[PDB]
PDB file of N, CA, C and O in Angstrom, chain B, residues numbered from 101:
ATOM      1  N   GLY B 101     100.739  87.363 185.723  1.00  0.00           N
ATOM      2  CA  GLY B 101     101.308  87.545 186.974  1.00  0.00           C
ATOM      3  C   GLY B 101     100.207  87.309 188.115  1.00  0.00           C
ATOM      4  O   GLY B 101      99.144  86.691 188.066  1.00  0.00           O
ATOM      5  N   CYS B 102     100.664  87.830 188.889  1.00  0.00           N
ATOM      6  CA  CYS B 102      99.577  87.967 190.354  1.00  0.00           C
ATOM      7  C   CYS B 102      98.545  89.231 190.032  1.00  0.00           C
ATOM      8  O   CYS B 102      97.453  89.132 189.471  1.00  0.00           O
ATOM      9  N   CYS B 103      98.983  90.078 190.380  1.00  0.00           N
ATOM     10  CA  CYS B 103      97.920  91.407 190.008  1.00  0.00           C
ATOM     11  C   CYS B 103      97.477  91.029 188.407  1.00  0.00           C
ATOM     12  O   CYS B 103      96.328  91.389 188.149  1.00  0.00           O
ATOM     13  N   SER B 104      98.060  90.494 187.509  1.00  0.00           N
ATOM     14  CA  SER B 104      97.651  90.614 185.875  1.00  0.00           C
ATOM     15  C   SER B 104      95.832  90.274 186.268  1.00  0.00           C
ATOM     16  O   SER B 104      94.963  90.760 185.545  1.00  0.00           O
ATOM     17  N   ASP B 105      95.574  89.645 187.140  1.00  0.00           N
ATOM     18  CA  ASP B 105      94.606  89.082 187.662  1.00  0.00           C
ATOM     19  C   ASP B 105      94.159  89.965 188.993  1.00  0.00           C
ATOM     20  O   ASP B 105      95.148  90.268 189.660  1.00  0.00           O
ATOM     21  N   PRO B 106      93.092  90.379 189.458  1.00  0.00           N
ATOM     22  CA  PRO B 106      92.517  91.290 190.296  1.00  0.00           C
ATOM     23  C   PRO B 106      93.024  90.706 191.505  1.00  0.00           C
ATOM     24  O   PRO B 106      93.359  91.472 192.409  1.00  0.00           O
ATOM     25  N   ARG B 107      93.137  89.394 191.667  1.00  0.00           N
ATOM     26  CA  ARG B 107      93.011  88.430 193.040  1.00  0.00           C
ATOM     27  C   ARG B 107      94.018  89.459 193.997  1.00  0.00           C
ATOM     28  O   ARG B 107      94.048  89.644 195.213  1.00  0.00           O
ATOM     29  N   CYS B 108      94.875  90.075 192.795  1.00  0.00           N
ATOM     30  CA  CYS B 108      96.423  90.756 194.024  1.00  0.00           C
ATOM     31  C   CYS B 108      95.976  92.208 193.500  1.00  0.00           C
ATOM     32  O   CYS B 108      95.641  92.891 194.468  1.00  0.00           O
ATOM     33  N   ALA B 109      95.886  92.747 192.559  1.00  0.00           N
ATOM     34  CA  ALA B 109      95.721  94.354 192.159  1.00  0.00           C
ATOM     35  C   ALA B 109      96.490  95.168 193.252  1.00  0.00           C
ATOM     36  O   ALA B 109      96.172  96.002 194.100  1.00  0.00           O
ATOM     37  N   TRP B 110      97.731  94.507 192.823  1.00  0.00           N
ATOM     38  CA  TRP B 110      98.929  95.753 193.903  1.00  0.00           C
ATOM     39  C   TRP B 110      99.499  96.595 192.782  1.00  0.00           C
ATOM     40  O   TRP B 110     100.706  96.766 192.953  1.00  0.00           O
ATOM     41  N   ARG B 111      98.991  97.224 191.603  1.00  0.00           N
ATOM     42  CA  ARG B 111      98.715  98.066 190.817  1.00  0.00           C
ATOM     43  C   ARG B 111      99.980  97.473 189.598  1.00  0.00           C
ATOM     44  O   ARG B 111     100.645  98.275 188.944  1.00  0.00           O
ATOM     45  N   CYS B 112     100.106  96.242 189.490  1.00  0.00           N
ATOM     46  CA  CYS B 112     101.090  95.438 188.652  1.00  0.00           C
ATOM     47  C   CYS B 112     102.346  96.097 188.691  1.00  0.00           C
ATOM     48  O   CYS B 112     103.308  95.630 188.082  1.00  0.00           O
TER      49      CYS B 112
END
């Protein structure tokens, strides 16, 4: 996922 990687970090 996106947040799976801290690039996103939207609490997943």
